[PDB]
RNA sequence: GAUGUCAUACUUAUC
């Protein structure tokens, strides 16, 4: 709606206004991190969610100011004036080729669906409250130190591993607490001050409501 | 380590020998010599751990008595995945003080 | 000097008032010329008067001095002299300054410290001269070579390194074409001296830069003493790399076997050493390459008898456990009747061989116990356990290794039941060495084997050796200890006998059986809760609480010991020396200037914050916070690491608002590791209790204008932050506004504190989405890269690389971008460096944050695989 | 094998005032010869003692052997004596 | 060999970022082309100083420490300058027989005020961009204003009243701009009362 | 706004693919590495049919699988390489239905780079010794030995770093009781970027060097290094020691070298084309995969072509050297990663674009009407080998697992005027491509 | 120095720009070598299989920029 | 701004 997203192969996608009376197209917002994307979704009016072809997803979040009257020499660094910012970035592994955010089951809240290059689906639902992903973020990091990978790679440095994360849970090493020993379970609830039922109802929960 | 400019490292193949440190030492890390958050244990290379050489204090040089780990920082930053932490040479350092 | 008689003029003068009795000096103020000193700096006794007369060697002269003033002056003129001569070595050159160190360290008059500080003078001008002291690698060698064989461990470390360095900065072929005159030649020392300096070259510039030429001097016949030099120096090279010559061990196993079939038995000799040395180091795998060796040297244990045999023995013990099971037992069933028939050699080198392979010898199967028992045990019993093996160290350490080997192989008690009638002897050393023999036979096997007959006999021992004993040693203690830690329960009825023992050494006219005795009390006291005896344990700390009052400190160290000990084997609310009437007891014991005694006086205080909180009425807490500001600035690194822990339990009982204040305080003293020792306590406590109540207080402080209270400060929040790590989330925006300041400041360790601080946030707020607040401090951190202090670069370059794992990689490209090809060269190292470290943090990483390379005209750098897109 | 900072002569703070000369030449004389003993008899320099030995290993064990002792007044620290620290009153 | 900044201005596509001494590097294209990139930072301007960067703010007066709110919202500031004041006035005596005999609580304001400015009153502050480096002069250069509209110091300065009537509201140059006409370098600019409703545009101009 | 990544759909893309004995039975089961996950399928003989037992997310990008026995053992552990600089030994367990790391030896860096091992795994066939070489001037070997606890045990790592050298492939050598061997084809980069002329690129061809680690001086040494006429791009071990020739041929585009040093020569043969495909102007045709089988009668290699031609290779040997080399067009297969032929009559063929197929063998051998041919035959003019194509009269399709990975675009769509919505996404590389219509409802 | 000549690819002060993209150059190829997804999608871009995309990519690896100069 | 002598002060949980 009266601007354009344009979405570059190596440094990152940058936002045009255009001007009713006018026909010019001047750039106002561009990004400072390189990230080389493939495809891209647009969430909000003001974010925009894009997806690498190296394996990693970010999301460019507009400055509040936002001003897109700019009528035409020099930028901020060799570009355009309002540096936009990230807020969410997560490694996925795999190139994800598709995102658009839809609602894949009828009654339950909107999210973005990713299709990625090999032959997985994800999604990304946002957190309600603080104090679910608060408690999302606590058995995230249990999990990470009592549930280490087989392969020896640590799990914050496979999401960190060309972006850094930032406000991103990721779900399936909180899914894999009801794949476990039930010793180290109970250990990980009393640590949560909770029961391992109804710590599988809450991972649960949030998984039923935001897909399948 | 981090105090004296003039120690060096083995930097060889790290083996299966597990380090050690001295009571004197005992806690502080290899790299950053920080005691709070251990995250890592140390792996000694074969040379540095051989007949008299095993059990050994990595810094120092004394008998070991505690196991030596890494510390929290450390582990994130990747300096545990380098060669063996093992001081060889003491230049500088304890070598003037017991001859004064 | 320091020892010589002083008159009553110069005593009176030395003290203050208010006490009741009950030419010759060199151009000004150099140091004090010996009078045998008089020969190397005999050119500045008169005046210099530089002109019209000032060659090259006046320059020498100067270098003379600054050597002068070095050697016998004060240790700053020492260290201003070291930077003197270290910043200007390569103008100076290394042929005068050759010429000057050489006849200074070769005269018959010198001293330890003298030659200890022209061998680091050696070493610290050894580095800038690089490849540069190549006619002066004899000169420097002929200095270097009788420090390998010194007593010191540390002159022999340093000549070592000394070596080290000659041989990494005059290469390979310059060592060699040094150390070809010095094979033949006729002082058997300079041999040896020069063998020893070929293998420590080999040690450091790899063993294939070596074997050819070691292989060409080992084949070489024209005199003996050419190959008896090559084989001394093929044992040096594999005595002194214990793993690195195993890839290399075919290689010099086929030079070695080209000896011990010549003539001459002293060559043969040295074949056996270096052939026992190469399976010293193949231990468990030598047999491999050494199947040409097994047959011309047990021949030699056959054809004669002597020193070669015992070499051949020495090796064939060495070679043993390195071979199959099947021939260690072929080998062991034809070399017992030598050892037995050895027994009774005159010859102490032929009976430590004889004692060192008769513990490889029986450390497998093959060799019964039966037999072991009854013809190899009673031999080496009476032959081997005298009173002159005990004077020499190698004769009495060696003899207890196979003692143990022998009571590992048969049994505890048969070398128990033998050993026993020892322990109440006449000499001290024979004594020591058995309580050892026992200490390691109690520690590997146990006490299960010894029954009821023995075990009052070696109690009985040991109190006879533990009460008779008249060195300071540590070795009859800690027997006693391992003896009550094997026994067990066993030691029943055993405690009236000892600890009656114990409070009658209490009282005596000396003060290290006072001493003794509790140490004795803290070894054995682990052994009384283990075994239903707690009156015992109650009474004796009723008796020790009164013998805080021993003039002695080392008897009131160790009584402090005891009572730490009573009081972590014991309740700490269930104590007859209960916590209400010992706490204000040891509030004037935490006075001592002794270090020892101050240590368990801190430890005791810590244990009563950390456990027994609860029974002072917050008041005493609050007077001894501030004598534990007294405790640090100690050389002994224990007392100020329990000091800071101490403080911490003190935060967090009687609450963190007056320690606080007693920490701020104590920040402003100007004096080395007080200030620190006081920051880590700061953040101790802030890590104890919450962070947020000494969140405005340490912001406080950096409101007072001082630089030593702001770097107080500063290091307690960067200790603070590192001791805190994920925490730190919420207590980075209060952070970020001091860090932006610090950072602002002319004062460079000012900015070398926020740099760690930086650091620490960086560390430790990783993966939580606060890469604002260090981006933010990254644009302030990134000016202080170009400072010239190596302590600032440093710090930089942490803050560098905790921040390229928080920010990201490609954030850390972007800020080195574009001086990679800057013009000027000091700002295009420190690119480079910071890019290397960012190459060795993520190298995977710095893929996708490559800029784009436009294709020159020859050469293509555009990336057309990434550039495609589907 | 000595650090610079022993010296032949200790000093000694927190003394008790009722010592008198036989038990602190009992307490000196432990370690070796006493050559000299002094104590204090200012109200600004109560307290303190200084004791000179007439050997300097003797001295040194006193002082490894004296520090923080047991003492009516107070721990019997013995430190090193020091010329500068001596005059700081002056 | 060493080509002029002429040379390299013409040959490079952004001659901007060429400086007079990145002539004498060993590559003055891959210069040219790192200085010109789109993430690049640049070099600080003390790599060509002599004062180390850290000499120059010598006898310049500087404030000891700027408190945020959050902090200076619970009382501990007052209650250290207090404490300091008492402490600065004892002498030797009153500061020995202190530490026998503390007298306790000094202070203690509360202990959940500091977790309610530690977590629930905290602020974020003023950061900025990756690409905004620091200098000496940084802190000083606050320099860095609207056509048709006035601060309040400038209204101060110059005697005008900011008013939503239109008649006494604009600066007196308004009748010079009805006599001559509109400025020409602006001409989209609108004052009130000559291309601009009164009542309406009360901001005294407007950019249309 | 924080939000949560979940998985809906797991991988099926399979990228390595193996086979053996993990659970411990006569039975044998396949291992699949799909990237960033690692499942276990059965492939029951009894409905030809995959059934999946075990999927895991392993949380980084394995470079390289391989499974491995012990002397004297039956069950079979898997050896995993990552992006960490770490290789993990691990037992699948059928009792808890997990995969227990038994092992975990780290070596390097994490990060996919090219100093960090993992990039290629070898093991010995006897199951003495494991070779982790990365792209370039790094190599290590552990030995992997039994304790009486009946214990897998790893050594210290050896080194056999070589600066200034790249490596292609690794693989080990069967030796019967002997020194474990590994051989690469490595490559020399000193010479090509040291000489400013560009003709030593042009002449710095791959060389097959052999490491023999030595297990009395232990260390690691390059016995034997012979230089090879064309570019080799694979390798493929053949048993030895009590069965036959025990060796290592190397694949390049329309060459099938056997190099056994010592006695045996290098036996080359042309790859046997299509007889009329206009598909290769001046291209050619190299392998990608081996997939070495033995039933216990002789030994065989089902290659598989650029194309698809999976061509049933056997070698005619003497007693102790090599004599000729066959080979024969056996079916068609559409391009597989990583083929895993499995006992009783089996073939998984694991599609990296597209779906994955598990076929029956039929017609094992088929040397009755086949025109085969061999690397003694007196053939010029090029490959003069032109063989037909032919439809499944070998194998016949037992089991179609659904595993396309390449997704690509994908939309969110209710076309199909249902309650709930569907996604409609593309799979396939090139021919196989096909538009998949993909609901939440079952079939 | 020694950084250099163990850890191949980190430069130095007087690095060339010829050097530094030809171990970036490597450093992509093997990034894309070992990365499934990379080479997952240089394999749906051409016609070519993964092992022909593998073969292509290592015998690139020998100057893979051109001649130095 | 540099040099060479002197003093003061600071940093690295150095001993």
């Given at each position: ?212 | ?100 | ?206 063993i294939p830069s070596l074997l050819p030429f070691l292989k060409a001097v080992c084949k070489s016949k024209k005199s003996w003493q ?189 070398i128990i039941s033998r050993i026993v009638d020892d322990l109440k002897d006449e000499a001290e050393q024979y004594r020591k060495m ?216 003190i935060a967090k009982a009687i609450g963190p608002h007056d320690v606080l204040a007693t920490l701020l305080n104590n920040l402003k ?202 | ?90 | ?208 | ?443 | ?69």
């Open positions: 709606g009266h601007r354009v997203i344009v979405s570059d192969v190596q440094e990152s996608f940058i936002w045009v206004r255009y001007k009713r009376n006018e026909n010019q197209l001047i750039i106002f917002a561009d990004d400072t991190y390189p990230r080389w994307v493939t495809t891209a979704s647009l969430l909000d009016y003001d974010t925009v969610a894009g997806a690498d072809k190296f394996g990693n997803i970010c999301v460019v979040r507009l400055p509040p100011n936002t001003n897109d009257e700019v009528d035409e020499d020099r930028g901020l660094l060799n570009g355009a004036s309002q540096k936009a910012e990230v807020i969410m970035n997560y490694h996925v592994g795999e190139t994800v080729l598709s995102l658009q955010k839809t609602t894949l089951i009828p009654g339950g809240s909107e999210s973005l669906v990713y299709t990625t290059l090999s032959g997985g689906i994800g999604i990304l639902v946002p957190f309600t409250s603080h104090e679910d992903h608060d408690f999302f973020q606590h058995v995230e990091m249990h999990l990470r130190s009592e549930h280490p990978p087989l392969c020896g790679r640590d799990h914050l440095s496979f999401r960190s591993y060309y972006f850094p994360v930032k406000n991103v849970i990721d779900g399936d090493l909180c899914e894999q607490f009801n794949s476990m020993e039930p010793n180290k379970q109970k250990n990980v609830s009393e640590e949560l001050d909770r029961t391992p039922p109804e710590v599988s109802k809450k991972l649960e929960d949030i998984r039923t409501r935001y897909a399948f | 380590a981090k105090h004296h400019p003039d120690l060096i490292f083995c930097r060889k193949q790290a083996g299966v020998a597990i380090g050690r440190l001295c009571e004197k030492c005992d806690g502080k890390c290899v790299i950053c010599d920080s005691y709070v958050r251990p995250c890592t244990l140390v792996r000694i290379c074969d040379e540095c751990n051989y007949g008299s050489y095993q059990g050994r204090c990595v810094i120092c040089g004394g008998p070991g008595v505690s196991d030596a780990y890494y510390c929290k920082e450390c582990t994130i930053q990747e300096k545990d995945r380098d060669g063996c932490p093992k001081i060889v040479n003491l230049g500088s350092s304890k070598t003037d003080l017991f001859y004064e | 000097e320091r020892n010589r008689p002083l008159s009553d003029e110069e005593l009176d003068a030395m003290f203050p008032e208010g006490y009741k009795v009950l030419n010759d000096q060199p151009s000004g103020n150099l140091p004090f010329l010996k009078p045998d000193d008089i020969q190397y700096f005999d050119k500045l006794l008169v005046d210099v008067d530089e002109s019209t007369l000032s060659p090259e060697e006046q320059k020498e002269r100067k270098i003379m001095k600054l050597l002068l003033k070095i050697k016998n002056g004060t240790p700053p003129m020492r260290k201003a002299a070291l930077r003197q001569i270290t910043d200007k070595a390569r103008e100076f050159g290394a042929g005068p300054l050759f010429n000057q160190i050489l006849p200074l360290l070769m005269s018959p008059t010198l001293e330890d410290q003298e030659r200890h500080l022209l061998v680091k003078v050696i070493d610290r001008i050894l580095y800038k001269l690089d490849d540069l002291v190549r006619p002066y690698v004899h000169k420097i060698l002929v200095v270097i070579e009788p420090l390998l064989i010194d007593e010191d461990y540390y002159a022999r470390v340093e000549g070592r390194e000394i070596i080290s360095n000659l041989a990494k900065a005059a290469g390979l072929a310059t060592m060699i074409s040094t150390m070809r005159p010095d094979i033949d030649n006729m002082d058997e020392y300079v041999r040896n001296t020069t063998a020893r300096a070929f293998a420590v070259v080999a040690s450091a510039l790899g050419a190959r008896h030099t090559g084989i001394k120096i093929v044992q040096q090279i594999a005595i002194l790399m214990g793993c690195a010559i195993l890839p290399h061990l075919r290689s010099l196993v086929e030079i070695i076997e080209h000896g011990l079939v010549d003539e001459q038995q002293k060559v043969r000799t040295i074949s056996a050493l270096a052939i026992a040395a190469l399976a010293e180091a193949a231990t468990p795998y030598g047999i491999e390459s050494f199947d040409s060796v097994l047959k011309p040297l047990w021949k030699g244990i056959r054809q004669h008898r002597g020193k070669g045999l015992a070499a051949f023995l020495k090796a064939i013990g060495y070679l043993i456990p390195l071979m199959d099971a099947e021939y260690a037992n072929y080998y062991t069933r034809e070399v017992m009747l030598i050892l037995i028939r050895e027994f009774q050699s005159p010859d102490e080198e032929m009976k430590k061989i004889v004692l060192k392979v008769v513990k490889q010898c029986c450390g497998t199967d093959g060799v019964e116990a039966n037999y072991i028992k009854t013809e190899i045990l009673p031999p080496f019993f009476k032959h081997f356990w005298q009173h002159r093996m005990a004077l020499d160290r190698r004769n009495y350490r060696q003899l207890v290794d196979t003692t143990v080997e022998l009571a590992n192989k048969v049994g505890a008690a048969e058995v309580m050892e023999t026992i200490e390691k036979i109690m520690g590997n096997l146990g006490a299960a084997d010894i029954d009821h007959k023995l075990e009052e006999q070696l109690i009985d021992g040991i109190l006879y050796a533990f009460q008779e004993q008249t060195t300071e040693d540590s070795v009859m203690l800690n027997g006693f200890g391992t003896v009550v830690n094997a026994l067990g329960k066993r030691v029943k009825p055993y405690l009236p006998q000892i600890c009656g023992t114990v409070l009658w050494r209490l009282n005596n006219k000396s003060a290290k059986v006072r001493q003794q005795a509790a140490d004795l009390i803290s070894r054995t006291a682990v052994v009384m809760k283990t075994c239903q005896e707690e009156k015992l344990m109650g009474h004796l700390g009723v008796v020790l609480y009164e013998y805080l009052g021993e003039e002695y400190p080392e008897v009131l160290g160790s009584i402090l010991g005891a009572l730490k000990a009573i009081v972590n084997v014991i309740g700490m609310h269930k104590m007859t020396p209960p916590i209400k009437d010992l706490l204000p007891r040891l509030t004037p014991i935490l006075k001592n200037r002794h270090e020892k005694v101050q240590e368990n006086c801190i430890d005791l205080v810590g244990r009563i914050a950390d456990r027994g909180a609860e029974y002072v009425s917050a008041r005493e807490w609050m007077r001894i916070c501030f004598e534990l500001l007294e405790l640090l600035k100690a050389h002994k690194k224990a007392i100020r690491r329990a000091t800071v822990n101490t403080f911490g339990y003293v100007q004096e080395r590791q007080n200030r620190v020792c006081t920051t880590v306590a700061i953040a101790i406590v802030a890590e104890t209790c919450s962070p947020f109540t000494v969140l405005p207080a340490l912001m406080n402080e950096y409101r007072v204008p001082e630089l030593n209270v702001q770097n107080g400060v500063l290091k307690s929040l960067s200790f603070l932050f590192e001791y805190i790590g994920e925490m730190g989330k919420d207590y980075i925006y209060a952070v970020t506004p001091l860090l932006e300041d610090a950072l602002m400041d002319r004062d460079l360790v000012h900015r070398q504190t926020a740099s760690a601080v930086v650091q620490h946030m960086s560390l430790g707020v990783y993966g939580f989405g606060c890469e604002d607040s260090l981006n933010h401090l990254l644009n302030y951190v990134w000016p202080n890269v170009f400072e010239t202090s190596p302590h600032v670069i440093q710090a930089v370059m942490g803050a560098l690389e905790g921040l390229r794992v928080a920010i990201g990689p490609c954030r850390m490209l972007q800020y080195c971008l574009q001086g990679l090809f800057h013009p000027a060269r000091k700002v295009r190292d420190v690119y480079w460096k910071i890019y290397n470290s960012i190459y060795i943090g993520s190298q995977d990483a710095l893929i996708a944050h490559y800029p784009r390379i436009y294709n020159d005209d020859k050469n293509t750098y555009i990336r057309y695989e990434l550039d495609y897109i589907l | 094998r000595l650090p610079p900072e022993v010296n032949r002569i200790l000093y000694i703070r927190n003394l008790p005032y009722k010592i008198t000369a036989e038990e602190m030449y009992d307490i000196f004389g432990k370690y070796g010869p006493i050559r000299q003993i002094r104590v204090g008899n200012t109200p600004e320099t109560r307290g303190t003692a200084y004791v000179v030995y007439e050997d300097i290993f003797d001295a040194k064990n006193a002082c490894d052997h004296l520090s923080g002792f047991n003492v009516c007044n107070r721990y019997l620290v013995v430190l090193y004596y020091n010329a500068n620290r001596a005059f700081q009153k002056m | 060999n060493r080509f002029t900044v002429a040379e390299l201005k013409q040959l490079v596509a952004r001659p901007d970022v060429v400086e007079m001494h990145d002539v004498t590097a060993q590559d003055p294209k891959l210069l040219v082309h790192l200085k010109a990139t789109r993430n690049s930072v640049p070099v600080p301007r003390h790599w060509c100083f002599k004062r180390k960067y850290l000499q120059g703010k010598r006898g310049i007066e500087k404030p000891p420490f700027e408190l945020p709110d959050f902090i200076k919202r619970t009382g501990i500031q007052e209650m250290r300058e207090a404490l300091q004041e008492k402490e600065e006035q004892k002498t030797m005596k009153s500061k020995m027989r202190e530490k026998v005999r503390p007298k306790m609580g000094k202070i203690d304001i509360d202990y959940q005020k500091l977790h309610d400015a530690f977590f629930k009153w905290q602020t974020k502050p003023k950061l900025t961009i990756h690409g905004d480096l620091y200098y000496e002069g940084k802190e000083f250069e606050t320099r860095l204003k609207k056509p048709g509209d006035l601060s309040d110091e400038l209204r101060i300065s110059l005697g005008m009243p900011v008013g939503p009537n239109a008649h006494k509201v604009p600066p007196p140059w308004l009748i010079a701009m009805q006599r001559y006409g509109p400025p020409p370098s602006y001409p989209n600019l609108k004052i009130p009362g000559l291309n601009s409703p009164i009542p309406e545009s009360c901001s005294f101009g407007y950019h249309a | 706004m924080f939000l949560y990544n979940l998985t809906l759909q797991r991988a099926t893309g399979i990228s390595f693919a193996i086979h053996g004995n993990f659970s411990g039975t006569k039975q044998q089961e396949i291992v699949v590495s799909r990237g960033k996950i690692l499942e276990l399928l059965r492939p029951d003989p009894n409905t030809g049919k995959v059934h999946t037992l075990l999927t895991v997310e392993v949380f980084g990008v394995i470079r390289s699988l391989m499974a491995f026995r012990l002397t004297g053992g039956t069950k079979d552990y898997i050896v995993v390489g990552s992006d960490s600089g770490r290789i993990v030994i691990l037992e699948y367990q059928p009792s808890k239905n997990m995969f227990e790391k038994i092992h975990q030896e780290t070596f390097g860096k994490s990060g996919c780079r090219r100093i960090v091992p993992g990039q290629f795994l070898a093991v010995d066939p006897k199951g003495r010794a494991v070779m982790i070489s990365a792209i370039e001037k790094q190599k290590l070997v552990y030995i992997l030995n039994r304790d009486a606890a009946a214990r897998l045990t790893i050594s210290s790592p050896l080194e056999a770093h070589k600066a200034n050298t790249l490596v292609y492939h690794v693989v080990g050598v069967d030796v019967g009781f002997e020194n474990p061997m590994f051989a690469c084809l490595e490559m020399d980069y000193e010479e090509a970027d040291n000489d400013p002329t560009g003709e030593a690129a042009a002449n710095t061809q791959q060389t097959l060097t052999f490491y023999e680690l030595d297990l009395g001086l232990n260390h690691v040494v390059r016995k034997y290094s012979e230089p090879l006429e064309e570019h080799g791009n694979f390798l493929i071990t053949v048993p030895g020691g009590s069965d036959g020739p025990s060796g290592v041929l190397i694949c390049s585009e329309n060459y099938i070298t056997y190099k056994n040093f010592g006695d045996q020569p290098d036996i080359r043969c042309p790859i046997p084309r299509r007889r009329n495909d206009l598909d290769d102007p001046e291209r050619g045709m190299i392998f990608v995969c081996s997939a070495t089988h033995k039933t216990k009668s002789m030994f065989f290699f089902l290659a598989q072509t650029e194309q698809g031609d999976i061509f049933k290779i056997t070698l005619e040997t003497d007693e102790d050297m090599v004599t000729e080399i066959r080979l024969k067009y056996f079916d068609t297969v559409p391009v597989a990663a990583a083929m895993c032929v499995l006992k009783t009559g089996f073939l998984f063929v694991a599609s990296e674009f597209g779906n994955h197929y598990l076929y029956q063998i039929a017609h094992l051998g088929d040397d009755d009407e086949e025109p085969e041919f061999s690397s003694a035959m007196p053939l010029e003019e090029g490959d003069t080998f032109f063989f037909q194509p032919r439809p499944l009269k070998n194998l016949v399709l037992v089991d179609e697992l659904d595993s396309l990975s390449p997704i690509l675009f994908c939309q969110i769509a209710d076309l199909a005027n249902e309650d709930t919505p569907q996604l409609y996404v593309a799979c396939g590389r090139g021919p196989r491509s096909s538009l998949r219509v993909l609901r939440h409802g079952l079939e | 120095e020694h950084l250099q000549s163990k850890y191949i690819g980190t430069g130095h002060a007087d690095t060339t720009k010829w050097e530094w993209l030809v171990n970036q150059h490597r450093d992509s190829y093997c990034s894309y070598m070992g990365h499934f997804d990379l080479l997952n999608y240089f394999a749906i871009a051409e016609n070519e299989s993964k092992a022909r995309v593998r073969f292509n990519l290592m015998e690139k690896m020998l100057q893979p920029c051109g001649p130095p100069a």
